[PDB]
Design a protein around this ligand. Structure first.
Ligand SMILES: [Mg+2]
Ligand SMILES: [Mg+2]
Ligand SMILES: [Mg+2]
Ligand SMILES: [Mg+2]
Ligand SMILES: [Mg+2]
Ligand SMILES: [Mg+2]
Ligand SMILES: [Mg+2]
Ligand SMILES: [Mg+2]
Ligand SMILES: [Mg+2]
Ligand SMILES: [Mg+2]
Ligand SMILES: [Mg+2]
Ligand SMILES: [Mg+2]
Ligand SMILES: [Mg+2]
Ligand SMILES: [Mg+2]
Ligand SMILES: [Mg+2]
Ligand SMILES: [Mg+2]
Ligand SMILES: [Mg+2]
Ligand SMILES: [Mg+2]
Ligand SMILES: [Mg+2]
Ligand SMILES: [Mg+2]
Ligand SMILES: [Mg+2]
Ligand SMILES: [Mg+2]
Ligand SMILES: [Mg+2]
Ligand SMILES: [Mg+2]
Ligand SMILES: [Mg+2]
Ligand SMILES: [Mg+2]
Ligand SMILES: [Mg+2]
Ligand SMILES: [Mg+2]
Ligand SMILES: [Mg+2]
Ligand SMILES: [Mg+2]
Ligand SMILES: [Mg+2]
Ligand SMILES: [Mg+2]
Lengths: 110, 216, 78, 144, 99, 116, 154, 40, 97
RNA sequence: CAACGUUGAGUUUGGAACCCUGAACAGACUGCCGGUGAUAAGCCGGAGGAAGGUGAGGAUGACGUCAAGUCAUCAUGCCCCUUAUGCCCUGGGCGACACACGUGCUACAAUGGCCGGGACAAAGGGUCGCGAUCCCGCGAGGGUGAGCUAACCCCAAAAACCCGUCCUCAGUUCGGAUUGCAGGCUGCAACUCGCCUGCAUGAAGCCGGAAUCGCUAGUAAUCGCCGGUCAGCCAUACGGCGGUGAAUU
C-alpha cells in the first residue's frame, strides 16, 4: 500500500511496515496499530476499512516533510543564534559533550 | 626484590596486635585517629623529657586497649630510670596530657609502664642505640659490631641488621648489612621482631632495619 | 514546576536598570544564569575567563544560559 | 497436587527418614529422601522433567545412580535443592542419591565405585586475580 | 600536601557547622512550599550563605598525610599509610587476606 | 625523508627535550641511510631523545639516543647510545642499527644452510 | 607440554543413543558452553535426516565419518636448511577429530536457514561422499601424494 | 543489542530500568504487541 | 536476656563466652548456648606502591565474629553475676532484654 | 525441619533428627600392596579413601640487576623564592582537534533479534543510610513511609536457560552512532562539561591486510549481580561473586 503518507510499506507485518515513514519509530507504530485500529496482519491483506482508519490516524502525527523542515528550522535557528551548539553545527563538531581528540568519525566524515 | 614486613606476615599466628580494641565501622576512623593522637603525645613527651636529662630511653612499644569505661595504655619500655626517677613521675604527668587529648566524656585513662627485661633482645631499642652512636659520627662498622655483641650477650638466637643511606657522609649512597646466626624470614612459626628506624644526619637520612629471631 | 536559575546580583541589577529605563553595560560572571524575558535589549558582557565579551540580547535568547554566548576556547587551525 | 503427595508420603520432615543422602557441588546443595515403591522424581515440589527442563543431560545425571542398579521402578525420590544453577543441583541430586543408596544396602558399593558416582566433585570456581581480566585471562598485550 | 589545603578544609568544616540547620530549613522550605515567584526569594536566601558552606564543597583528605586522593573512608586514611600501619599491627582486626 | 621508506613509520619523540628542524633533518638522514638499504624488512623506527647535564641536571652534558626497530618478521632491535652532542648520538645509534640489521638480514636471508 | 604428557579423559555417552560419537559431535558443535542448545540442534538434525531418508541415522554417522576421515596428511619439517612438506601419518583420535571438524566447518558455511538443516545436509552429503568435507580430505591426500617423495621415514 | 537504551537488554546493561525494563508487573510497559490472528 | 558478643580475634571472644556461660551456670539460670552467628568479613584492596604500578595490590580483611548467648530466666543473682563480669578489652557486648 | 493458616504474617507450637553457621578435632604420610630399580632416592601400576603423589587456588619474591620508578602521598641533604616561586576568592583550564599510537565496550545477525508466560545463585553493601506498602506519572521519578544498627528488614529484577507467538536472509524486527524536541534527579550552580526518561533520527558496519595477543579444567568462551571511590557522575574502568561450560597437547 503506497497511499500512507506518499511512501511504500511493502509485503510485511503491519507495524514494521508502517515504520518506513520518517516520523514513525517503534512506539507510534504499535500504539496506532494495537490501540486505535486494533488489527495486525500483512500489508497487502489490509481491507479497505482498516486502511482508511490507518491513513486517517497517521495523518495527525508529523511526517517526513513536516519533521524534516521542523528539525531543519531548529538547527537553523540555533545557527543564527550564535550559541555554542550552533557553532558546533556550523563547524561540524559534536555538541553533546563528547571529546574531539579521538572519535568524531561519524560526524567528522562530512 | 621486596620482602614483607615480617610483622605483617604473621598476624594472628605468632604475633598479637597492639591496639586491642573494637569499634563499629563508623566509629573505627575516629578511634584510630584517637590512638594516633595519644601515641603521638606519649612519644613526644618522653623524647623531650628524657633527652633533656641525657639518657638512652627505649620506648619498645605502646599497647592500647579500649574498654567502654577506662582506656588503658601499656608502655613497653627498656629503661624507665629516666621516666620513674623524675619527681613528676611519667604516670601522672602523662596521664593529665593524654587525658587532655582524647576526651574526658565517658572515657577516663589509665597509664601502666612495663619493664621489658632484656632491652637488647628488642630490635627497636637496639636501633635507637645504633641511631645514637651513628649520630655521634662513630663509623658504622664499630656501631654494627657493638650492637651484635650487646645483643648476643643479651640472649638472642639470630639477628640481621641493615643500614642504608649515605654512609660516612660519602657522596654516593649504599647498603650495608650483617647477618648473624640463623634468621628464617619465610617461616611463619618463627617468632620475629622487626623494626624500622630513621635517622637525621648532617648528610641527610639514614635507614636502619633490624630482624630478631627468638626461636620457634 | 521547578524554578529556572538566575544569580541574585544579576537579577537585582537588571531590576534596577529596567526600572530606571536605561541601557547600560552589565559585566557578569554568572555563565549559569538563564536569560529571563525581563532582560531583552540589554547588553551583557560575560566573562570568558579573561575578557568580558559584550552580547546583545534578543527574543530568541530566552530559555538558554549565558555562557553559551561567550566562547571560552581560542581555536583557529593547526 | 504434588505437594500433597510429598506431604502425605513424608510426615517426618526431611531430617527424620531412615534413608537420606545430601549432594553438594558448586554452590548447589540438595537433600535427598529415598523411599520404596513405584518411582517418581519430585524436586522442590515439582516434577523432574518440569524443573530440570528436560535437557537430556541433566535428567540422565539424576537417573544414572539408579541405572547401575536397575532400581528405577523400585524407588521413589523426593529432594529439596537450593544454591547454584540447575546443572549443579542435578549433580548434587546424583551424589545424594548415591549416598542414600549406600545407606540402604552396603553391597551397592562395588558398582557405585566403578562408575565413579561416590566422589564429591571438588572443582569449583577460581577467584579473580588482580591485574588479570578474569581468572587466568590476561589483558590484551602489546610487545610494543 | 600543602598546609594551606588542610586549612581550607578546616574552614569549610567550620562554616558548614555554622550554617547547617539554616541550610536544612531553607531546603525543606523550597521543597515543600509552592508558588514559583516565592521560590525566587527563598532561592535568594539559598544563594546568600558562603560558597564554602555547601556540603558538596567539603572534601575528605587523609588525616595523617592530607593526600586528597585515594581515601578509603572507614579508616579516614590514604592507602599507603593504611598499608604500613596494617604491617605494624596498629589496625585492630586487619589481616593480610587470602580467600 | 624517503619515498622508498614510505612504508615505514618514523616516530620522533623528544623526552625531556625540544625538537628543532635541524634535528629533524639530521634524524631523517642518519636513520635514513641505516634503514634505506634494508627497507624491505623494516617496519617501525622509534627514536627517543633524552638530554641531561649542563644546566638541567648534575653530571656531564649527556645526550642519549634510543632507537628501536621492528621488522615485518623479527621484532626488538634495541639501540642505546650516550654522547656529547645530539648529532654525535644519532651518528652512534645509526652505526649500531646498521650492524644489527645486516646481522638479521645475514642470518635469515642468506639461504643460510642450517642443518639440524 | 614439554614435560608431562596427557592422561586419558572419560569418554562419555550421549544420553538418548548411548554413543561416544554423537557426544563427540555435540561437544564440538558447542559455543559459549550452552549444551541446552547444542543437543536441540543435533537432535533436530537427526529428525531431518530420518525425515529425508528411511535409513538408520546411527549408520549415516559411521558413513559420514568413515567418508571424511583422513588416513594421512602432511606437516612442515625443517630438514637440512630445506623446508619440506613431509607426509606424517595420522592417529585414530586425530582422524575422528579432523573428520568432525571439516564436517562442522563445511556445515557452518552452508547457504541454508537452520543449523540442524545444514548439519543434516552435510551428513547426507558426506555419507554419500558427495560434498565439500570429503572433497577437502581428498585434497589433503592429493597434496600428501605429490609430496610423497619427501618422507624419508617411508 | 546491548547498546540500545530502547531495549530491555540495553537498559539492563546501562543499569537504568525504564519504559522497556520495568520495576514491577504494575508499571506500564510500551503499547502492547499482543494481537496476531493466525488461524489454520 | 540475650547478649551479642562481637570481637575480632577468636580466643578472646570464646574465653569471654566461657566466663559469661560459667558465671551464669554457677548462679543457676538456664543457658541456650554460645550460638555462632555468620562471620562478617570485609575485604579492602589498595595499591602497594606510592606511584605508577597498578598491578601491585594489597588485600587485607577485617574479620568480625559474633556470638550469641541466650540466658532464659533472669535471677537477681544471675543479672548481678553477669553485670559484674570482667570481659577483655577487645570484645563488645550487646544486651537485649 | 515439620505444622496451623496468611501473603503482613505470627514469635504460634514441637524436633536438633536434614541443612547451615563456626569452634574444637580427625584425615593424605609414597602410609599399605604389587611391579620395577645398584640395597638408594625415586619412577609405572593397584587397593582403600571425599580426596594420591606440591589434592586445588592464595599470601609468600634470596644474594643481586636495571646509577629502573617515585623529592606531587610521607620523610629528608643541599640549593633557590620570600609585598612573591607563598596565601584568599570568582571565572576559565586539565573535557581543545588535521592526525598518529595503545587499552576497552558494542557490533555486522538466525548457535540469532522481539514479545509473553514460567525456574535456579553467590558474595556483598545499608541510621545524615538502604528504603518495602500504597497512591499520582507512558516514563525516569514524585507523595507516603513499614522493617532494619542487620543469618531477622531493604537494595533485589539475577541474566544466560526453557515452554509458546512473530520475523526464515534483507544494510532488515540486524546494528545502533549522530542529532532535534520534550522532560526527570543530584546539587547554591549541569552553557563550556553530569547522569537518567519519553517521542523522533537511524551513520558506519556482511567477521576485517601485513602482523599480533590470551588461554591446559571449572580454565577459555559466554551471562549477569555487588562493592569501593561517591551530593551527582564520564564505570564500558578497577576489585570481587556466582550461572552455563568446551576443544587440544
Ligand atoms: Mg634483595
Ligand atoms: Mg565466571
Ligand atoms: Mg570462590
Ligand atoms: Mg589494566
Ligand atoms: Mg571487571
Ligand atoms: Mg609538606
Ligand atoms: Mg565531592
Ligand atoms: Mg625428557
Ligand atoms: Mg534492535
Ligand atoms: Mg550509563
Ligand atoms: Mg528508567
Ligand atoms: Mg502506573
Ligand atoms: Mg522450636
Ligand atoms: Mg591408587
Ligand atoms: Mg598445595
Ligand atoms: Mg614457601
Ligand atoms: Mg634508582
Ligand atoms: Mg624520570
Ligand atoms: Mg621540596
Ligand atoms: Mg605557580
Ligand atoms: Mg576557582
Ligand atoms: Mg585528564
Ligand atoms: Mg573544553
Ligand atoms: Mg523472557
Ligand atoms: Mg555503594
Ligand atoms: Mg520512591
Ligand atoms: Mg555502508
Ligand atoms: Mg547480512
Ligand atoms: Mg603469547
Ligand atoms: Mg601453566
Ligand atoms: Mg556513586
Ligand atoms: Mg571503555
Amino acid at each position: 500500500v503506497r497511499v500512507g503518507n506518499v511512501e511504500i510499506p511493502n509485503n510485511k507485518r503491519v507495524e514494521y511496515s508502517l515504520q518506513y515513514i520518517h516520523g514513525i519509530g517503534r512506539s507510534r507504530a504499535r500504539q496506532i496499530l494495537c490501540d486505535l485500529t486494533l488489527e495486525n496482519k500483512l500489508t497487502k491483506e489490509l481491507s479497505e476499512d482498516e486502511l482508511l482508519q490507518v491513513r486517517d490516524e497517521v495523518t495527525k502525527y508529523m511526517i517526513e516533510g513536516d519533521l524534516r523542515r521542523f528539525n531543519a528550522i531548529a538547527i537553523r535557528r540555533l545557527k543564527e543564534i550564535q550559541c555554542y551548539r550552533g557553532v558546533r553545527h556550523i563547524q561540524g563538531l559534536p555538541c553533546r559533550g563528547q571529546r574531539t581528540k579521538n572519535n568524531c568519525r561519524t560526524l567528522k566524515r562530512g | 626484590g621486596q620482602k614483607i614486613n615480617p610483622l605483617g606476615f604473621r598476624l594472628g599466628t605468632t604475633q598479637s596486635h597492639y591496639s586491642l580494641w573494637f569499634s563499629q565501622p563508623k566509629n573505627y576512623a575516629e578511634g584510630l585517629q584517637e590512638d594516633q593522637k595519644i601515641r603521638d603525645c606519649i612519644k613526644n613527651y618522653v623524647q623531650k623529657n628524657t633527652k633533656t636529662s641525657s639518657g638512652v630511653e627505649g620506648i619498645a612499644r605502646i599497647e592500647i586497649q579500649k574498654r567502654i569505661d577506662l582506656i588503658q595504655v601499656i608502655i613497653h619500655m627498656g629503661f624507665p630510670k629516666l621516666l620513674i626517677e623524675n619527681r613528676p613521675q611519667g604516670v601522672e604527668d602523662l596521664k593529665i596530657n593524654v587525658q587532655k587529648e582524647l576526651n574526658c566524656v565517658n572515657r577516663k585513662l589509665n597509664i601502666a609502664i612495663t619493664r621489658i627485661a632484656k632491652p637488647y633482645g628488642d630490635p627497636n631499642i637496639l636501633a635507637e642505640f645504633i641511631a645514637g652512636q651513628l649520630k655521634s659520627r662513630v663509623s658504622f662498622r664499630k656501631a654494627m659490631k657493638k650492637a651484635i655483641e650487646l645483643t648476643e650477650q643479651a640472649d638472642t638466637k639470630g639477628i640481621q641488621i641493615q643500614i642504608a643511606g649515605r654512609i660516612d657522609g660519602k657522596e654516593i649512597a649504599r647498603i650495608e648489612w650483617i647477618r648473624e646466626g640463623r634468621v628464617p624470614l619465610q617461616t611463619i612459626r618463627a617468632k620475629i621482631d622487626y623494626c624500622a628506624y630513621t635517622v637525621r644526619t648532617i648528610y641527610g637520612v639514614l635507614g636502619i632495619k633490624i630482624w630478631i629471631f627468638m626461636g620457634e | 514546576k521547578k524554578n529556572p536559575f538566575v544569580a541574585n546580583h544579576l537579577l537585582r541589577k537588571i531590576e534596577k536598570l529596567n526600572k530606571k529605563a536605561e541601557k547600560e553595560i552589565i559585566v557578569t560572571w554568572s555563565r549559569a544564569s538563564t536569560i529571563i524575558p525581563t532582560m531583552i535589549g540589554h547588553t551583557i558582557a560575560i566573562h570568558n575567563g579573561r575578557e568580558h565579551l559584550p552580547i546583545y540580547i534578543t527574543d530568541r535568547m530566552v530559555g538558554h544560559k549565558l555562557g553559551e554566548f561567550a566562547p571560552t576556547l581560542n581555536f583557529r587551525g593547526h | 497436587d504434588l505437594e500433597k503427595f510429598v506431604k502425605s508420603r513424608l510426615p517426618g520432615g526431611f531430617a527424620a527418614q531412615t534413608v537420606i543422602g545430601t549432594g553438594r557441588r558448586k554452590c548447589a546443595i540438595a537433600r535427598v529422601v529415598l523411599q520404596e515403591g513405584t518411582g517418581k522424581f519430585i524436586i522442590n515440589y515439582r516434577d523432574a522433567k518440569e524443573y530440570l527442563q528436560g535437557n537430556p543431560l541433566w535428567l540422565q545425571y539424576v537417573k544414572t545412580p539408579l541405572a547401575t542398579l536397575g532400581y528405577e521402578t523400585n524407588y521413589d525420590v523426593f529432594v529439596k535443592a537450593h544454591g547454584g544453577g540447575l546443572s549443579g543441583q542435578a549433580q548434587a541430586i546424583s551424589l545424594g542419591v548415591a549416598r542414600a543408596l549406600l545407606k540402604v544396602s552396603a553391597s551397592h558399593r562395588a558398582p557405585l565405585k566403578q562408575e565413579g558416582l561416590l566422589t564429591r566433585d571438588s572443582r569449583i570456581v577460581e577467584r579473580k586475580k588482580p591485574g588479570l581480566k578474569k581468572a587466568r585471562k590476561a589483558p590484551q598485550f602489546s610487545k610494543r | 600536601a600543602r598546609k594551606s589545603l588542610i586549612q581550607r578544609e578546616k574552614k569549610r568544616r567550620n562554616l558548614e557547622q555554622k550554617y547547617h540547620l539554616i541550610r536544612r530549613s531553607s531546603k525543606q522550605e523550597i521543597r515543600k512550599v509552592t508558588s514559583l515567584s516565592d521560590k525566587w526569594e527563598i532561592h535568594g536566601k539559598l544563594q546568600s550563605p558562603p560558597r564554602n558552606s555547601a556540603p558538596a564543597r567539603l572534601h575528605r583528605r587523609c588525616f595523617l598525610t592530607g593526600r586528597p586522593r585515594a581515601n578509603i573512608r572507614d579508616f579516614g586514611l590514604s592507602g599507603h599509610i593504611l598499608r604500613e600501619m596494617v604491617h605494624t599491627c596498629l589496625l585492630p582486626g586487619a589481616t593480610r587476606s587470602s580467600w | 625523508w624517503d619515498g622508498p621508506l614510505s612504508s615505514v613509520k618514523l616516530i620522533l619523540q623528544g623526552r625531556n627535550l625540544e625538537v628543532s628542524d635541524n634535528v629533524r633533518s639530521h634524524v631523517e638522514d642518519k636513520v635514513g641511510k641505516s634503514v634505506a638499504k634494508h627497507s624491505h624488512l623494516v617496519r617501525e623506527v622509534d627514536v627517543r631523545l633524552s638530554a641531561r647535564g649542563g644546566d638541567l641536571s648534575k653530571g656531564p652534558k649527556l645526550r642519549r639516543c634510543e632507537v628501536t626497530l621492528f621488522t615485518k618478521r623479527h621484532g626488538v632491535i634495541r639501540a642505546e647510545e650516550d654522547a656529547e652532542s645530539l648529532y654525535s648520538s644519532i651518528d652512534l645509534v645509526s652505526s649500531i642499527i646498521q650492524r644489527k640489521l645486516r646481522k638479521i638480514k645475514d642470518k635469515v636471508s642468506d639461504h643460510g644452510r642450517h642443518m639440524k | 607440554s614439554r614435560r608431562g604428557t596427557v592422561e586419558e579423559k572419560t569418554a562419555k555417552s550421549d544420553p538418548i543413543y548411548r554413543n561416544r560419537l554423537v557426544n563427540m559431535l555435540v561437544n564440538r558443535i558447542l559455543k559459549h558452553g550452552k549444551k541446552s542448545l547444542a543437543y536441540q540442534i543435533l537432535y533436530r538434525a537427526v529428525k531431518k535426516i530420518q525425515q529425508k531418508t528411511e535409513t538408520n541415522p546411527l549408520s549415516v554417522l559411521r558413513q559420514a565419518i568413515r567418508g571424511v576421515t583422513p588416513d594421512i596428511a602432511v606437516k612442515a619439517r625443517r630438514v637440512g636448511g630445506s623446508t619440506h612438506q613431509v607426509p606424517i601419518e595420522i592417529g585414530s583420535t586425530q582422524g575422528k577429530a579432523l573428520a568432525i571438524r571439516w564436517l562442522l566447518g563445511a556445515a557452518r558455511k552452508r547457504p541454508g536457514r537452520n543449523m540442524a538443516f545444514k548439519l543434516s545436509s552435510e551428513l547426507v552429503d558426506a555419507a554419500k561422499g558427495s560434498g565439500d568435507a570429503v572433497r577437502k580430505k581428498e585434497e589433503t591426500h592429493r597434496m600428501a601424494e605429490a609430496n610423497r617423495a619427501f618422507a624419508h621415514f617411508r | 543489542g546491548r547498546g540500545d537504551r530502547k531495549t530491555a537488554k540495553g537498559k539492563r546493561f546501562n543499569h537504568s530500568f525504564g519504559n522497556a525494563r520495568p520495576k514491577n508487573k504494575n508499571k506500564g510497559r510500551g503499547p502492547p504487541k499482543a494481537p496476531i490472528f493466525p488461524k489454520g | 536476656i540475650r547478649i551479642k558478643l562481637r570481637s575480632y580475634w577468636v580466643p578472646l571472644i570464646e574465653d569471654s563466652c566461657k566466663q559469661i556461660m560459667d558465671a551464669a551456670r554457677t548462679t543457676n539460670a538456664k543457658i541456650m548456648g554460645p550460638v555462632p552467628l555468620p562471620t562478617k568479613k570485609r575485604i579492602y584492596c589498595v595499591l602497594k606502591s606510592p606511584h605508577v604500578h597498578k598491578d601491585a595490590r594489597f588485600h587485607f580483611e577485617i574479620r568480625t565474629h559474633q556470638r550469641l548467648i541466650d540466658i532464659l530466666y533472669p535471677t537477681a543473682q544471675t543479672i548481678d553475676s553477669l553485670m559484674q563480669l570482667d570481659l577483655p578489652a577487645g570484645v563488645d557486648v550487646e544486651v537485649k532484654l
